[PDB]
Amino acid sequence: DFEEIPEEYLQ
Amino acid sequence: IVEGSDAEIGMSPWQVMLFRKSPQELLCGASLISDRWVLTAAHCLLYPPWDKNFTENDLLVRIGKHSRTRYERNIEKISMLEKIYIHPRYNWRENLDRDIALMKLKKPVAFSDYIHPVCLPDRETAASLLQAGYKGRVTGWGNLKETWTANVGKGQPSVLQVVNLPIVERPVCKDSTRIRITDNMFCAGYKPDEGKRGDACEGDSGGPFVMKSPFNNRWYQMGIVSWGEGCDRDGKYGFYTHVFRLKKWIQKVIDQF
Amino acid sequence: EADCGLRPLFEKKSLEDKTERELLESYI
Ligand SMILES: *C[C@@](*)(O)[C@H](CCCNC(N)=[NH2+])NC(=O)[C@@H]1CCCN1C(=O)[C@H](N)Cc1ccccc1
């Protein structure tokens, strides 16, 4: 695999 | 999805991906029924035997996606859950009866060319569309093969997969599983003598089994990917949650008025 | 009554997808 999503969402 | 195809872009704009925060991973499919409500299978969020019991903080919902792994900056939309609702009488102990669940978004998503809601059936539509022999469509980013040689390839597709299956006669369905099927279930798939194949598979759960009406030209969600025995096995069929029969529960939870 | 089931890139543009007909024919 997955490309990274903004960290804002991942805590 | 087994024996399916790549979907065309925006061919199923109500398709939602259920993403796990940590570790990052694909949990299941789902469908968008309104700017703020999502419908999935309960077993996606709660299944004790496999020791599975997620909560609003553990997940993310991703709408408007095509690719399985890419972060589609320009088209997808990532939302957080506010509250999750599981059918009070969902039976995870023996047959997965009432494998249904609703999820409330924190803030309404904005519809687009890649994000649009599917319709829920009414008594008439259900009555006339859910008939043995008629074909429905299934979609998801789930496994492409029941099993496969490790490291030689990738069991999961790059882009969203689609498959068209026919509904099967209750009698045929019942005589194929030692499991206790109920009135809140239905089956689909070709017969051994039919000359075609296809099935949903792990990772596909929560996806929608939809149908099209030639009179009003719109798509209706008749079922939810629920359970099965293997993937694409002969003389075996996939089971789906009967959305029509559970409609009052949805209605009760949603409370539009 | 809220718009639903009509795809922005298909129904709304008078375009049909590649396997849709398989569905409809199953009716007749
Ligand atoms: C959670 C879903 O992704 C998955 C869908 C499988 C679809 N398969 C086919 N052929 N369409 N569901 C499951 O894996 C469910 C959840 C737990 C058990 N399970 C099964 O489908 C088992 N393989 C069979 C089963 C076990 C217990 C109760 C009912 C069925």
User: Catalytic: which of B66, B205, B226, B232?
Assistant: B205
Tokens of B191: 């017969």
CB distance B97 to ligand 1 below 6 Å: no
CATH 2.40.10.10 fits B13-117+245-257, yes or no: yes
Q: How many residues does this entry show for chain B? A: 257
In angstroms, what is the span from residue B51 Cα to ligand 1's centroid?
14
User: Chain-centre distance of CA B121, in angstroms?
Assistant: 16
Residues 6+ apart with CB under 8 A from B119: B218, B219, B220, B221, C4, C5
Interchain contact, C23 vs B34, CB within 8 Å: no
Domain boundaries along the sequence of chain C: 1-28
Amino acid (1-letter code) at residue B41: A
> How far apart, in whole angstroms, are the C-alpha atoms of residue B92 and residue C27?
35
B99 is catalytic: yes
Distance (Å) of CA B36 to CA A9, B116, B135, B226, B256: 18, 12, 29, 23, 11
> How far apart, in whole angstroms, are the C-alpha atoms of residue B231 and residue B138?
14
CB distance B201 to ligand 1 below 6 Å: yes
**Which of B240, B61, B87 has the alpha carbon at shortest distance from B167?**
B240
Residue closest via CA to ligand 1's atom 19 equals B227
Encode B78-108: b = buried (16+ Cβ within 10 Å), e = exposed: bbebeebbbbeebebeebbbbbbbbbebeee
Helix, strand or coil, per DSSP, at residue B116: coil
> How far apart, in whole angstroms, are the C-alpha atoms of residue B168 and residue B177?
13
Using an 8 Å Cβ cutoff, are B5 and B92 in contact?
A: no
Residue B210 backbone dihedrals phi, psi, to 5 degrees? -105, 165
Using an 8 Å Cβ cutoff, are B30 and B40 in contact?
A: yes
Tokens of B233: 């096995």
> How far apart, in whole angstroms, are the C-alpha atoms of residue B36 and residue B34?
5
Q: From the CA of A7, how many Å to the nearest CA of chain B?
A: 10
Q: Which of residues 71-100 of B touch A (CB under 8 A)?
A: 71, 78, 80
DSSP state of B114: S
**Through-space distance between the first and last CA atoms of chain C, rounded to whole angstroms:** 30
Do the domains at B1-12+118-244 and B13-117+245-257 have one common CATH topology? yes
Encode C12-23: b = buried (16+ Cβ within 10 Å), e = exposed: eeeeebebbeeb
Answer whether the bond into residue B23 is a cis peptide, omega within 30°: yes
The nearest alpha carbon in chain C to B130 belongs to C27
Domain boundaries along the sequence of chain B: 1-12+118-244, 13-117+245-257
Residue B216 backbone dihedrals phi, psi, to 5 degrees? -115, 5
Alpha-carbon dihedral sign for residues B55, B56, B58, B60 = positive
Helix, strand or coil, per DSSP, at residue B244: helix
In angstroms, what is the span from residue C15 Cα to ligand 1's centroid?
35
Beginning with the edge strand found earlier in the chain, give each strand of the sheet holding B238-242 in spatial order: B5-6, B161-166, B135-140, B208-212, B219-227, B238-242, B185-188
> How far apart, in whole angstroms, are the C-alpha atoms of residue B99 and residue C3?
27
Report resolution in angstroms. Answer: 3.0
- Closest ligand 1 atom number to CA of residue B203: 3
Tokens of A4: 């990274």
Segment holding B170, helix H or strand E: helix B170-174
User: Chain-centre distance of CA B61, in angstroms?
Assistant: 14
CB distance B47 to ligand 1 below 6 Å: yes
Residues 6+ apart with CB under 8 A from B176: B187, B235, B236, B237
Residue B221 backbone dihedrals phi, psi, to 5 degrees? -90, 105
CATH classification code of B1-12+118-244: 2.40.10.10
User: Catalytic: which of B43, B66, B87, B242?
Assistant: B43
Beta bridge partners of B161: B6, B140
Using an 8 Å Cβ cutoff, are B109 and B33 in contact?
A: no
CB distance B28 to ligand 1 below 6 Å: yes
Return the residue matching tokens 């509904």.
B167
Alpha-carbon dihedral sign for residues B185, B188, B193, B199 = negative
Residue B160 backbone dihedrals phi, psi, to 5 degrees? -50, 130
Tokens of B160: 């969203």
Burial of B153 (0-12, 13-18, 19+ CB in 10 A): exposed
Q: From the CA of B151, how many Å to the nearest CA of chain A?
A: 14
Q: What architecture (CATH level 2) is domain C1-28?
A: Irregular (4.10)
